[PDB]
Design an enzyme around this catalytic site. Structure first.
Site, PDB file in Angstrom:
ATOM      1  N   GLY A  53       0.690  -1.225   0.008  1.00  0.00           N
ATOM      2  CA  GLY A  53      -0.105   0.004  -0.157  1.00  0.00           C
ATOM      3  C   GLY A  53       0.898   1.253   0.028  1.00  0.00           C
ATOM      4  N   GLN A  54       2.094   1.219  -0.008  1.00  0.00           N
ATOM      5  CA  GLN A  54       2.912   2.492  -0.271  1.00  0.00           C
ATOM      6  C   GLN A  54       2.662   3.006  -1.497  1.00  0.00           C
ATOM      7  N   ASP A  55       2.956   4.281  -1.267  1.00  0.00           N
ATOM      8  CA  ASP A  55       2.439   5.071  -2.832  1.00  0.00           C
ATOM      9  C   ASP A  55       3.299   4.567  -4.164  1.00  0.00           C
ATOM     10  N   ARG A  58       1.068   1.558  -4.904  1.00  0.00           N
ATOM     11  CA  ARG A  58      -0.315   1.785  -5.063  1.00  0.00           C
ATOM     12  C   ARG A  58      -0.546   2.025  -6.445  1.00  0.00           C
TER      13      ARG A  58
END
Lengths: 159, 126, 139, 129
Positions: A53-55, A58
């Site tokens: 889920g980190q950018d 993502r």
């Protein structure tokens, strides 16, 4: 059954997956990538794609959209600052054509923490009531205890 | 022998749900053949084929692992968002047997850049 | 770290049944094929373990319809290069489950591709033990 | 006044040693001669995951101390001490230990070594590199 599990970083996605696969609570590192695993529940074999889920990551989920029968969206119920951001990610995810008919299961997670928002609160903040085009469900979970996890697999299997 | 377009294209199914080690390994062999026979890959289809293959690393078969090492090195430069394959290579690399060991380090290290350098070191020292 | 410039296994015209370039000097097909035609013209219809082409010692062998190549440096000799070329012939033979001809190579294009990459790695001689290569590769 | 807060049921053999993890005191590991060291949490009677740290029963468990060190050690009567990484779950290396059943093994925090003891009356120090 093919499952895509996403959510912001630190929501508990990998903890959930390996609790389900190993009955164990592992010591996670941030997932730069995915984990993919197969889990047996009641005659269904769920192939779960846990995508970090980190950018940077993502930005990559869209490659895992296609062929997805169901979507697990994990939320950290204790993090109130990022709930809007979760709402924003999830809303445009709902607009994705490859995700068009996929079953939508929200996990409001870390329910074990004293100030965790309730599932009802989360339902209001994520705008879940406004989904009329497909199946949705929200489930309070604690991935460390295992609470709500199989209730999730249950709901999902009834797509 | 082959047509580069058809083979680069049909590789995109890996990206979705199908993983089929036999089919994908064949398709991979075909990629290696296109280069070997002497052909040049088309970039869109290559980029697509590269993101698709990484899913195939889940299934651990020695021939499929082998195909995967040669194909990612050849397709590495004519592909995007290649970074995803590092983890899969480390997973393969620690797995004991020369088929994985040697061929993975070489494929991994080729794709690996200074950020990624740190990751491969434990496995490299071994 | 460098011995082998390139490995080619060529039909009896010099055309690319196979070549895999352990040099960065041929990546485009036109030139990879030109190289192949060049080395095959000198070396062929005089079988020895020596040829001198392009100022580089070229070591080669032959079969029914193929000539098999290692190109390496000429500060060396045939025998060092030959050890690579013997591995190349041998390993393909044992791997494919049939001696190197155009037919064996085509029969299993995959065994051939994988087997050669184990033998040479970016012009360094990675492997030279035919047996090791064959176990190392999975058809 | 030393009431029984929780009871942990998991180990099926003689629980030789217990150590608390210094990164979460709620976690401890216990070594039992059942060829595992099981990492448990307080909250959970049951061991929340099992490590199979040794092959001839685990005399000792220790953590390699610190805020950024997820490690286990197992000692066993197979003459050997084994190093494990609890984060990766793999066995990092095997230490020769002693020339007789390794009674206990532990990690020194500051120095890169493992100090082990054996029923042969010998203690050995091994460089952890």
């Amino acid at each position: 059954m093919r499952i895509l599990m996403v959510g912001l970083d630190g929501a508990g996605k990998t903890t959930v997956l390996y609790k389900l696969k190993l009955g164990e609570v592992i010591t996670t590192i941030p997932t730069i990538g995915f984990n993919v695993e197969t889990v047996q529940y009641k005659n269904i074999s769920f192939t779960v794609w846990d995508v970090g889920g980190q950018d940077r990551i993502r930005s990559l989920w869209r490659h895992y959209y296609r062929n997805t029968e169901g979507v697990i969206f994990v939320v950290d119920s204790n993090d109130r600052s990022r709930i809007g951001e979760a709402r924003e990610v999830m809303q445009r995810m709902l607009n994705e054509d490859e995700l068009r008919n996929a079953a939508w299961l929200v996990f409001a997670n870390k329910q074990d923490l004293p100030e965790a928002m309730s599932a009802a609160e989360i339902t209001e903040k994520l705008g879940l009531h406004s989904i009329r085009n497909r199946p949705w469900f929200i489930q309070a979970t604690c991935a460390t205890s295992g609470e709500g996890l199989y209730e999730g697999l249950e709901w999902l299997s009834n797509s | 022998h082959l047509e580069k377009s058809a083979v680069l294209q049909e590789a995109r199914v890996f990206n979705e749900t199908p993983i089929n080690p036999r089919k994908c390994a064949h398709i991979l062999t075909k990629i290696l053949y296109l280069i070997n026979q002497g052909e040049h890959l088309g970039t869109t289809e290559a980029t697509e084929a590269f993101f698709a293959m990484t899913k195939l690393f889940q299934s651990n078969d020695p021939t499929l692992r082998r195909m995967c090492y040669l194909t990612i090195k050849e397709m590495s430069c004519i592909a995007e968002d290649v970074i995803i394959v590092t983890s899969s290579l480390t997973k393969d690399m620690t797995g004991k047997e020369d088929n994985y060991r040697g061929p993975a380090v070489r494929a991994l290290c080729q794709i690996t850049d200074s950020t990624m350098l740190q990751a491969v070191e434990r496995y490299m020292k071994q | 770290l460098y011995t082998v410039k390139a490995i080619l296994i060529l039909d009896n015209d010099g055309d690319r049944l196979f070549a895999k370039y352990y040099d960065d000097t041929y990546p485009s097909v036109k030139e990879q094929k030109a190289f192949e035609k060049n080395i095959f013209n000198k070396t062929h219809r005089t079988d020895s373990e020596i040829a001198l082409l392009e100022g580089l010692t070229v070591v080669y062998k032959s079969s029914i319809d193929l000539y098999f190549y290692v190109i390496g440096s000429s500060y060396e000799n045939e025998l060092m290069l030959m050890a690579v070329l013997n591995c190349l012939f041998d390993s393909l033979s044992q791997m494919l489950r049939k001696n190197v001809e155009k037919r064996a190579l085509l029969e299993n294009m995959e065994g051939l591709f994988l087997a050669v990459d184990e033998i040479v790695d970016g012009g360094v001689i990675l492997e030279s033990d035919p047996q090791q290569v064959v176990h190392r590769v999975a058809l | 006044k030393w009431s029984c807060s929780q009871v942990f049921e998991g180990h099926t053999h003689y629980v030789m040693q217990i150590v608390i993890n210094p990164k979460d005191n709620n976690q401890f590991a216990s070594a039992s001669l059942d060829r595992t060291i099981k990492v448990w949490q307080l909250g959970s009677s049951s061991p929340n995951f099992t490590l199979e740290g040794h092959e001839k029963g685990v005399n000792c468990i220790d953590y390699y101390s610190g805020g950024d060190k997820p490690y286990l050690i197992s000692g066993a009567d197979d003459r050997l001490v084994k190093i494990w990484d609890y984060q990766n779950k793999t066995c990092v290396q095997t230490l020769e230990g002693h020339a007789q059943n390794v009674s206990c093994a532990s990690f020194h925090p500051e120095l890169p070594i493992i100090i082990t003891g054996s029923e042969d009356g010998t203690v050995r120090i091994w460089h952890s590199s």
